[PDB]
Amino acid sequence: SSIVCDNGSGMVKAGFSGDDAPRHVFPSIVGRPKNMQAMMGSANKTVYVGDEAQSKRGVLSLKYPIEHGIVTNWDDMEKIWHHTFYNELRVNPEQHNVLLTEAPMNPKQNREKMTQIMFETFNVPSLYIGIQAVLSLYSSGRTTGIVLDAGDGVTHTVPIYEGYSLPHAVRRVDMAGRDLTEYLMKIMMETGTTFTTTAEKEIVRNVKEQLCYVALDFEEEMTNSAKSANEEAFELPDGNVMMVGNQRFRCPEVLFKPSLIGLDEAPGFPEMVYQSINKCDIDVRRELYGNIVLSGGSTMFLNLPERLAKEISNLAPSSIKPKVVAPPERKYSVWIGGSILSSLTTFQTMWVKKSEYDESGPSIVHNKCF
Amino acid sequence: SSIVCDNGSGMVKAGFSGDDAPRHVFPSIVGRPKNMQAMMGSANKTVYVGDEAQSKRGVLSLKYPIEHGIVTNWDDMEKIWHHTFYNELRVNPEQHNVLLTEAPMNPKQNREKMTQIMFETFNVPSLYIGIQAVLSLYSSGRTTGIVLDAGDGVTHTVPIYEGYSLPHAVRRVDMAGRDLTEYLMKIMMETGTTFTTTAEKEIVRNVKEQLCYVALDFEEEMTNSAKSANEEAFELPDGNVMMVGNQRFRCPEVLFKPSLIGLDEAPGFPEMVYQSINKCDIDVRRELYGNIVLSGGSTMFLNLPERLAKEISNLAPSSIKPKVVAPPERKYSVWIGGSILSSLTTFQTMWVKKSEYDESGPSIVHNKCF
Amino acid sequence: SSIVCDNGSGMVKAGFSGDDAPRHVFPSIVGRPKNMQAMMGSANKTVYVGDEAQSKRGVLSLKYPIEHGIVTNWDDMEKIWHHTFYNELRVNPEQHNVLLTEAPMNPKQNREKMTQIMFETFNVPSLYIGIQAVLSLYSSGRTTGIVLDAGDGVTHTVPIYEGYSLPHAVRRVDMAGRDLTEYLMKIMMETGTTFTTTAEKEIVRNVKEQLCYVALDFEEEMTNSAKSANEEAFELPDGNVMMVGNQRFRCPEVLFKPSLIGLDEAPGFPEMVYQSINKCDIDVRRELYGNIVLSGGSTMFLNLPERLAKEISNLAPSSIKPKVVAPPERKYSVWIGGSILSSLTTFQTMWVKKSEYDESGPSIVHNKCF
Amino acid sequence: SSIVCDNGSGMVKAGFSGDDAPRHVFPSIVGRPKNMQAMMGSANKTVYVGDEAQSKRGVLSLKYPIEHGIVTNWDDMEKIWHHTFYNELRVNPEQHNVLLTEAPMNPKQNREKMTQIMFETFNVPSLYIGIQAVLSLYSSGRTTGIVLDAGDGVTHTVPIYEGYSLPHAVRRVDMAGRDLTEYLMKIMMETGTTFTTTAEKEIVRNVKEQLCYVALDFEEEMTNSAKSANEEAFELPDGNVMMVGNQRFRCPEVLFKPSLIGLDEAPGFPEMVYQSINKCDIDVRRELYGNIVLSGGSTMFLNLPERLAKEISNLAPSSIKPKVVAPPERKYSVWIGGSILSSLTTFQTMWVKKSEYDESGPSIVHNKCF
Amino acid sequence: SSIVCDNGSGMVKAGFSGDDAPRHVFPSIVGRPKNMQAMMGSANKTVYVGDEAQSKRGVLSLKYPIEHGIVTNWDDMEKIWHHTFYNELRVNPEQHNVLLTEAPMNPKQNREKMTQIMFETFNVPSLYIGIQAVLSLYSSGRTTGIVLDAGDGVTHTVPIYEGYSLPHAVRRVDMAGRDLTEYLMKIMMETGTTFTTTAEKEIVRNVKEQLCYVALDFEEEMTNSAKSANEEAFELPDGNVMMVGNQRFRCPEVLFKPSLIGLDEAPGFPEMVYQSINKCDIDVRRELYGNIVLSGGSTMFLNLPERLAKEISNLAPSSIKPKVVAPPERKYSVWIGGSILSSLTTFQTMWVKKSEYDESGPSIVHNKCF
Ligand SMILES: Nc1ncnc2c1ncn2[C@@H]1O[C@H](COP(=O)(O)OP(=O)(O)O)[C@@H](O)[C@H]1O
Ligand SMILES: Nc1ncnc2c1ncn2[C@@H]1O[C@H](COP(=O)(O)OP(=O)(O)O)[C@@H](O)[C@H]1O
Ligand SMILES: Nc1ncnc2c1ncn2[C@@H]1O[C@H](COP(=O)(O)OP(=O)(O)O)[C@@H](O)[C@H]1O
Ligand SMILES: Nc1ncnc2c1ncn2[C@@H]1O[C@H](COP(=O)(O)OP(=O)(O)O)[C@@H](O)[C@H]1O
Ligand SMILES: Nc1ncnc2c1ncn2[C@@H]1O[C@H](COP(=O)(O)OP(=O)(O)O)[C@@H](O)[C@H]1O
Ligand SMILES: [Mg+2]
Ligand SMILES: [Mg+2]
Ligand SMILES: [Mg+2]
Ligand SMILES: [Mg+2]
Ligand SMILES: [Mg+2]
């Protein structure tokens, strides 16, 4: 069959074409022990990948091969790929077509080396590398709209009008869920709870995923929370309980004002969409405003679509009624679109055969894959 | 075969690998006469080791070569080793592998000189020196847990998570059964029975081993015993009978509050475990609380595990349910774990060959033995 | 005396009439701090203009008052003017005549408000606003020719035949050095070097000004550079070194094919000149082809005049031999022409006196200034 | 006048504004007796603060109110403050302005309660709480640079460029002189000298302050010291002499590799500075490399600045020449900077008046004090 | 007033508070006739106490109620107390406060029954029982030091540092002047003079008090005395003269080596002090070495302080200079300290009132008296 592997910065989503949801979602981490093994043969493993690293994180040093959508450690990335194939999918990579995803405006060498590893190390017969926002637009079952995809390493905006790309209106900000997690971990020190190790960063990520929400009116929420002192209790793995105060709505606020983490000139979620739309031709802006698609796990915060729609409406002219489409399953929207695309009968001629790679070498994906 | 010799401060336990219990347990004492021999040839021995010294203790001055887990008299220690081999095991040390144990954070010169004596004086072919808490965890048949080992000279706490050492969470207090015996001998003077000689210290040790018990509630027990005047009779070797009052539960109480013997800042049995657990990573604390292993003869007091479990539960957060594992045979738990480890087929490459010692000299055990 | 101030989009050039070169050239930027001042009195300034903003750009947010030749921020523009007078020229504006320049076919309100600010805020006695291409033709010392001026915000083409204007043959494209800088900053992401802040945009501008060159044959250069992988090293301010590959000749290529930045229907440098010439009367085309004048800093790329002359010759009929005049000092050609014009004895009756402004109000410059 | 009180984790430094050095430096310890007073009226004191506790440490249990820059015992802290005012400065706190210091990214409640105690318990008229690194940069008489301050409880790095804060580039590691003292006390057990009581911890601290030095090449020093067995003699208070071997250069080595004390993922002295610089804007990094300021007593080890400068140069690009500024009086650099700041005529409007506290309550220092 | 009664094993010292010396010192003996009274009314007394028993010792059987500081005969002890009050002090015990002394670590029932007898049999209004070494330290007018008190039944060592007790460093050996007298009486049999009756034991005690001296070098003295045969003549009451040879310096030698009387493991005078000092904290040892206080009549031998100081200096480290304080009136040092303590105005609230005894019964002195 065909393999749809959505290698994200934080989570790896793998499966087969035609399915409605990925069958294997595990973190994109590689852990190694930081202490000598006192016993004999109990923990003989030297490298842990995926859920195994997450399970033993208390005695491991976790590492992310992908940073901001760019693979910074290729040995760990190929370890993750070997895991994803053999231990996760339990299929021979040589017998299946592999579909990969990548953020727009990534370095060319990243895609080139990814293709080289897929064709040589795993002997994949045919390969194709797509764009995450295009697949996210595919999954919604529409051919026109602007996709705001925010995952774990990068958020990008890609407008598409009736199937035609608008390459000069594509935005990209290296600010996503990992930056939010780091900011939350920093601002939790005010309450008196400091997390420093990589293992303790996962606890902060869980706090972010469970308690954080987007405030409808940040300034009003900030003042009312100051006096009422409303806070929620989060139970740490050791059994201790810590209280999370205004950090619940301050952590996702950095999406709407990235100056809180040093990105002073970064636009923010509504401003980036507005600028991307205004970079397009005047005749297509009205249909782009009326169809805004959210994707990625960093768009899953409570009240985020409503806040985004309210903020965009202020920027847009009074005759425009923006509509934000936030599917409940938008976390896996990229994988669903990739599965849909790979199941199309027209797409079967778009695969990059290994024979073509043997002829023209790398950078073949830079000409036919878009 | 292989020899598993657990040289403790008070008791020497020797045997062969594969056995379920040591075949020779005798005190680690060396006695010498303090009076001239009036008769001719009846008692021509000048040095007594082991049970012989204990049998003739009335006319001998007993000495312990090991103090607080550290050999303070090497001539007496090598006398004890010569006894343990020839008179006890009746085997040639040159034909067997010797496994030795040592408390954590001991001086390096102690282990170096022990290795030198084993390799040169006894010509042992291969040697290995382990850690008592690790072997105690081996004997329980588990790879995760925190071991509280309290013998005769020192009590130490060693956390181990899934076979990985946690060296920065290891505690060590030089307070064990010998200090309890001395405290009992001091507080028996209140009743009107003073023991001063080393021979009379063994009587106090027997009193401690037979009558002393840990009170579930020390303050309630102290008041009720004051009015009821409940006491038990202990028969001295000479035939006299002395009464032991509140000293039955006061003597082991110093384990839970070492300030009674001048160790004002020492933690105590539950506090030391709590601190050792809290020195570990937050992700491993929950599994360490749920598996606490007791070892050594000083943990054999009545109601000691129940009192320890109750005390630790107060310190631990309300979401934690500590479980204390106290095997009935925990006195020999270190030797059992050493026998199990030496019988493993993987361990056979971990012996320190005598050829290696001839090459790199001493301190070879500091690099490969842990 | 008289003041010749050439307020460009990127650079401000000021001086006095009769001089052969501007005495003060500084960027047209206004910077404001983005962080709170921790110390006391060291950096008490709140707004930085000119070279001061460029010097402290690492802690400032730089802004350009002029976009595409149109003043989009009048407060910052009047700050720049106040700087240019007092801190740069150190003369009283009330005592001198001011000569200003403006791109053709600009909005009328822009010139009206510029005149209002000059007459009211600075109390300038007499004012005149010219056209940059006319002054560029003045500086060459000729009365016939077609001027292709490309600065930082806009490129315009103005044909003049024997001193007579040809208003219906004037072209204007909002594509100049700033668009080239943005395109270079976008295409440097392929190598793996992303610049996002306004301060880092100046580094990209310096890269463009130092390394970029116009390829004689773009298609041949593109293929040969692909295989030879020829690239140059540029040292960033922090000390790091980044390699610039094919972006050296791709960045200025957008002048000859503006479709690379979304201006699909824009003509380009040779096509715009050809269309502007063909919009003129048939009797004047031959003399316009034989005298093409380049102006502005965006025409300073290596091999740009040769490439332009080759490209125009293909469009022109075979009986025409176009000649492109590219003076070495064409960056300041507008200012030189303004200085020459203001020093003419005939021009002294063309100033707009402040009394005339008090009578007819604004839009007086729309009738007598051309 | 004004009071400059630098409440550190280990040492309290107090004085008046305008002086070049603190007039009263005493340890921040509170001691209580652990034994009953046998005599009558000789030692009627029940709590000892400062040098008195240090003098009688042999019969006292010493406690540090401040841990890692955070006050963990407010009663002892206010005892220390009462001592510092009345017994040390011998002035009425109600008649003077008090300047306090605090580590960056401390819990907000710590500063709030400190302000509450100063305003209510001592009735201080006006108060101000600064940042230790900012004052350390003040004392050097420069407005640009990066300050590496390492005291007794925490080490922090604060970059400042031309007086503007860089809040997102501030690092903080809870590893300072007290952790070094604990590590030295642990590793002295290898030689055969165990210190356990709090009184004996001061002896280890004196050993660290007198004998420990930073090795220029740790690996080369470790091997050469192993064979030469070079060691120095330290005389204990009782008159005994103990030998300190490789622990002289191993104890301060944990600053450059904090994994020796369980901080496996902590950066270390050069790595923390490098990361803090690289968190800043590219335009300011070159000036931050060329001006590195050391502060605190934990930076006073021999050859520490040279080792740090060598280590940073390897991390920095080859075009960068880092310069480390280590004033001889850098132990009191924070107090000197505080005295300089409080003597400035501009600073006199920055005090938090008690009337303001009565109006807005606490957290007033969170808005105007930085 | 107040009564200071120092009930020793051999001598009873009584007096009133404020005096510089006891006004009544008599032996603590009770004698009874061993023969029938032949005459009529000449010697009608049946029990003799004090000097009367000593005067008629030739026809009486003398008995000591106190053995090793413990009252073994309460009827004789209360006879001695009745004598000491009525026949010696000639005051009503009901009208005075009584201060009593007791050796440390005595049985609790001894003190309880002493208090019961004082409160019930003699109807003493208020009572207090102190420690002999504490009072001996009081008499020297110092609050720090280590007291070596050796009387007639027991020698004990009590360190005190700045008024704070060090209970875990207190030593006690049941070997004092009576054991020396018995040893002298045994070793006088070698010369040919056997004393067996209790009356003849007093002659041996007088010989010990008049002729015995401590040898500076025992081994050198033993050899030189063997050849020179130097001996002194002692006149018995009957008029006979016996010669005392090497027994002059052998009798007090048992203090420095108690193995001569079967106390093989007893430390001896310098060893006991050294061990008691080393049981203390390291910070207080230096001041304890420099202040050693001698007390009791068994320390009155010639050259004893010099020999003790020489012996201790060998044990102490080379950096220590021990100083032994031996007041000329150290025999009554305990009584002087008791008189000083009872005259303090602060001590007046420390008396145990008879009403308190009626409420809480006995063992009240175990809580408030120390
Ligand atoms: N329910 C949630 N609410 C808020 N944030 C979430 C939620 N689930 C995941 N996230 C954030 O989204 C990130 C994962 O996004 P994902 O789409 O998996 O990224 P990628 O596409 O790189 O795999 C995590 O870092 C997490 O912080
Ligand atoms: N049944 C018992 N109850 C209480 N204490 C005991 C008991 N048996 C032994 N002990 C104490 O434990 C000590 C022996 O412990 P052990 O484990 O033999 O030490 P080591 O490991 O050094 O040989 C003795 O000093 C004794 O006081
Ligand atoms: N030597 C050069 N080579 C290439 N481009 C240059 C050079 N010098 C300046 N430029 C470009 O020209 C622009 C400045 O042109 P200028 O004539 O100063 O514009 P204006 O007329 O608006 O002041 C800059 O944005 C820069 O990108
Ligand atoms: N000369 C020295 N050499 C090495 N370390 C020192 C020296 N003096 C002090 N220290 C260490 O520095 C610490 C005191 O630093 P200090 O700046 O007083 O901290 P704080 O700012 O918290 O008062 C002590 O714990 C000590 O270990
Ligand atoms: N001048 C002396 N020289 C040597 N020993 C003496 C001297 N005087 C008394 N003694 C010894 O000291 C003992 C008396 O000591 P004392 O302090 O009275 O004891 P207590 O404190 O029990 O009353 C006697 O047994 C005697 O042997
Ligand atoms: Mg994704
Ligand atoms: Mg043991
Ligand atoms: Mg211009
Ligand atoms: Mg400090
Ligand atoms: Mg006495």
From TrEMBL, chains A, B, C, D, E:
Record bears the keyword S-adenosyl-L-methionine: no
Gene Ontology biological process terms from the UniProt entry: chromatin remodeling
UniProt entry keywords in alphabetical sequence: ATP-binding, Cytoplasm, Cytoskeleton, Nucleotide-binding
Predominant place of localization: cytoplasm
Any one GO MF annotation of this record: ATP binding
GO CC, alphabetical: actin cytoskeleton; kinetoplast
Signal peptide coordinates: none
Localisation per UniProt entry: Cytoplasm, Cytoskeleton
Gene3D superfamilies per UniProt: 3.30.420.40, Actin, Chain A, domain 4
Task of the protein: Actins are highly conserved proteins that are involved in various types of cell motility and are ubiquitously expressed in all eukaryotic cells.
Homology family: Belongs to the actin family.
The protein, known as: Actin
Gene from which the chain derives: ACT
